[PDB]
Design an enzyme around this catalytic site. Structure first.
Site, PDB file in Angstrom:
ATOM      1  N   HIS A  47     -12.607  14.866  16.790  1.00 38.29           N
ATOM      2  CA  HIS A  47     -13.124  15.713  17.988  1.00 38.29           C
ATOM      3  C   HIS A  47     -12.599  17.149  17.785  1.00 38.29           C
ATOM      4  CE1 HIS A  47     -14.419  12.448  20.859  1.00 38.29           C
ATOM      5  NE2 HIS A  47     -14.316  11.857  19.670  1.00 38.29           N
ATOM      6  N   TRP A 164     -19.088   6.412   5.664  1.00 43.03           N
ATOM      7  CA  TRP A 164     -17.741   6.386   5.114  1.00 43.03           C
ATOM      8  C   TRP A 164     -16.755   6.798   6.142  1.00 43.03           C
ATOM      9  CZ3 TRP A 164     -19.505   9.773   0.345  1.00 43.03           C
ATOM     10  CH2 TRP A 164     -20.419   9.006  -0.388  1.00 43.03           C
TER      11      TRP A 164
HETATM   12 CA    CA Z   1     -12.026  22.536  16.697  1.00 45.73          CA
END
Ligand code: CA
Ligand code: HEM
Ligand code: CA
Length: 315
Positions: A47, A164
């Site tokens: 994130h 992956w």
């Molecule tokens: Ca960032």
């Protein structure tokens, strides 16, 4: 180089990482365990890094999700990430490394605590973030395969690199998808970095482990496991199903491709040639001991085979 405490590393600028390693193994990962804080720190590396769009901006793996937390923890895809951001921010304030470098170092140190795991290449020197990520750049479990592939491709990942990277879901659980059953994992071995996630997501769904109407959740094949709709669809879509099945019972491929594609993710927004390689500071992970398997009592008839070129393997 020999650091002031006698530990060695190829480039001397990396010696500043050894006290930081020791603090995080004791005080962020509860004594170098492969547990929820490692899983949350690995989620954090994505994130942070994925906030990177050629057309809209964001600096990638820059520490923005810490530096501009007030903004980025408001985005719905970042729900629940404030807890790990709040735990990591004091280590960044106490030590002398940028938030971008800290998030990627903590993720690599964490993955090294998990059997089967790898040492993700680690580079030191990212400057502090200068802008928050744009909104709406993190894939959600209720997004289509074409939406997730287009977002990840916009940030530089091909469909096989998306599969992956999703080996991460081998050491992963959910607390927000069904808040009635927090901590329910995506595979049966959430403290082992192995191929079980790729096997178990290929089983036919059977039940919901908690409630039945949660957005982004698919039926799971097991009472003690939760399944995201995005993983359910990626394991079956013709764009990604053959690559997904190729990871089953293929731990060398999971290790080589996860290390390389994590390094590419950790460097989004950055230039390796301007940083210092400090890979050899990451601890050596334990290896696997047990073979890949279907869950006991399941058979090939419970697998929804999705690769026309190659039958699912006998385990
Ligand atoms: Ca960032
Ligand atoms: C590409 C599409 C992706 C989607 C839709 C997605 C979705 C999700 C969701 C919904 C959760 C559960 C959050 C919660 O409810 O607590 C989660 C957890 C997690 N994700 Fe993914 N994810 C994706 C890719 C990735 C990538 C590329 C990584 C690599 C670092 C990653 C690492 C993790 C980890 C390690 C957890 C477990 C967190 C924990 O146990 O505390 N994810 N993901
Ligand atoms: Ca696992």
């Amino acid at each position: 180089a020999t650091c002031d405490d006698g530990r060695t590393t190829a480039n001397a600028a990396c010696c500043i990482l050894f006290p930081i390693l020791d603090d995080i193994q004791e005080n962020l990962f509860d004594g170098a365990q492969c547990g929820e804080e490692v899983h949350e720190s690995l989620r954090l590396t994505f994130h942070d890094a994925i906030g990177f769009s050629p057309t809209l901006g964001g600096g990638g793996a820059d520490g923005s999700i810490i530096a501009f937390d007030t903004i980025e923890t408001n985005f719905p895809a970042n729900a629940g990430i404030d807890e790990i951001v709040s735990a990591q921010k004091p280590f960044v304030a106490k030590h002398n490394i940028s938030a971008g470098d800290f998030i990627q170092f903590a993720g690599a140190v964490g993955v090294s605590n998990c059997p089967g795991g790898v040492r993700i290449p680690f580079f030191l020197g990212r400057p502090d973030a200068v802008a928050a990520s744009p909104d709406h750049l993190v894939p959600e479990p209720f997004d289509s395969v074409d939406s997730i592939l287009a977002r990840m491709g916009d940030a530089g990942f091909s469909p096989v690199e998306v599969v992956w990277l999703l080996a991460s879901h081998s050491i992963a659980a959910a607390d927000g998808v069904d808040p009635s059953i927090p901590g329910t994992p995506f595979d049966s071995t959430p403290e082992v970095f192995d191929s079980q996630f790729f096997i178990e997501t290929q089983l036919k769904g059977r039940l919901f482990p908690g409630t039945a109407d949660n957005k982004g959740e698919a039926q799971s094949p097991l009472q003690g496991e939760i399944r995201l709709q995005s993983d359910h669809l990626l394991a079956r879509d013709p764009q990604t199903a053959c690559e997904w099945q190729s990871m089953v019972n293929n731990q060398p491929k999971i290790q080589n491709r996860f290390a390389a594609t994590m390094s590419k993710m950790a460097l989004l927004g950055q230039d390796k040639t301007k940083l210092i390689d400090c890979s050899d500071v990451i601890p050596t992970p334990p290896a696997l001991v047990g073979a890949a398997h279907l869950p006991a009592g399941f058979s090939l008839s419970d697998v929804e085979q999705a690769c026309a070129a190659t039958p699912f393997p006998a385990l």
